[PDB]
Design an enzyme around this catalytic site. Structure first.
Site, PDB file in Angstrom:
ATOM      1  CG  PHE A 187      24.488  32.901  26.027  1.00 62.93           C
ATOM      2  CD1 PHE A 187      25.593  32.617  25.242  1.00 62.93           C
ATOM      3  CD2 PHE A 187      24.602  33.903  26.976  1.00 62.93           C
ATOM      4  CE1 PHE A 187      26.791  33.292  25.384  1.00 62.93           C
ATOM      5  CE2 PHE A 187      25.788  34.597  27.126  1.00 62.93           C
ATOM      6  CZ  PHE A 187      26.875  34.284  26.337  1.00 62.93           C
ATOM      7  CG  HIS A 233      35.023  33.449  27.461  1.00 58.76           C
ATOM      8  ND1 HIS A 233      34.839  33.453  28.818  1.00 58.76           N
ATOM      9  CD2 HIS A 233      34.540  34.629  27.007  1.00 58.76           C
ATOM     10  CE1 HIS A 233      34.249  34.580  29.193  1.00 58.76           C
ATOM     11  NE2 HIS A 233      34.062  35.296  28.094  1.00 58.76           N
ATOM     12  CG  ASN A 276      37.214  34.864  31.206  1.00 58.23           C
ATOM     13  OD1 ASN A 276      37.589  34.380  30.119  1.00 58.23           O
ATOM     14  ND2 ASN A 276      36.628  36.052  31.201  1.00 58.23           N
TER      15      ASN A 276
HETATM   16  O1  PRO Z   1      28.336  34.297  31.885  1.00 56.61           O
HETATM   17  C1  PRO Z   1      28.515  35.040  30.909  1.00 56.61           C
HETATM   18  O2  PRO Z   1      27.578  35.799  30.611  1.00 56.61           O
HETATM   19  C2  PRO Z   1      29.822  35.004  30.095  1.00 56.61           C
HETATM   20  C3  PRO Z   1      29.613  34.211  28.783  1.00 56.61           C
HETATM   21  C4  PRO Z   1      29.777  32.811  29.288  1.00 56.61           C
HETATM   22  C5  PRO Z   1      31.066  32.921  30.053  1.00 56.61           C
HETATM   23  N1  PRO Z   1      30.962  34.250  30.641  1.00 56.61           N
END
Ligand code: PRO
Length: 172
Positions: free
Chosen positions: A67, A133, A109
């Site tokens: 991810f 985002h 965010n």
């Molecule tokens: O941390 C998370 O899960 C989400 C995706 C990356 C930015 N905010």
């Protein structure tokens, strides 16, 4: 128009692990790019939090395999903190750029219009984040360094060791 170039030198468990070089999209999201640039150089000094507006010394506190790697919390170090050069939170500038693949640089965010200093580097295409985002740049060197950091993440988000931005700044 123009594009700033910025870098991170990374340590993992204290071991020097290489440099990540990023190109910012100043031409598409100048306010978002400009905040990140200033946090690389440290040029706006001490922020409202009383801490340096500077990624130097901060860590990737949230890292999720397949991810993305996430940092920028130089006030709380844990996802609760961070501060933009503008003073705490600023609106989503635009969603013109998309999350198309590994290397994408995007703002973390807490919902609409809550950009601070937290950001993430994608290790995959994350199309589901498009329109939520703000993407403001991409990795152009060191994606291998990004992978090395990614190998220290867990499904839960907790890193297995400190992945630190040991130095950073602007190249041009
Ligand atoms: O941390 C998370 O899960 C989400 C995706 C990356 C930015 N905010």
């Amino acid at each position: 128009m123009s594009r700033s170039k910025v870098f991170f030198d990374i340590t993992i468990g204290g071991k020097a692990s290489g440099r990540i070089v990023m190109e910012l999209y100043d031409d598409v999201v100048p306010k978002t790019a400009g905040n990140f640039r200033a946090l690389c150089t440290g040029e706006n000094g001490i922020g409202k939090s009383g801490k340096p507006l500077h990624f130097k010394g901060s860590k990737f506190h949230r890292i999720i395999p397949n991810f993305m790697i996430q940092g920028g919390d130089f006030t709380r170090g844990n996802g609760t903190g961070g501060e933009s050069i503008y003073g705490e939170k600023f609106p989503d500038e635009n969603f013109k750029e998309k999350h198309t693949g590994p290397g994408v640089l995007s703002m973390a965010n807490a919902g609409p219009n809550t950009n601070g200093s937290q950001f993430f580097l994608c290790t995959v295409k994350t199309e589901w984040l498009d329109g939520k985002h703000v993407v403001f740049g991409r990795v152009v060197e060191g994606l291998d360094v990004v992978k090395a950091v990614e190998s220290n993440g867990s499904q839960s988000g907790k890193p297995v060791k400190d992945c630190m931005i040991a130095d950073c700044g602007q190249l041009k």
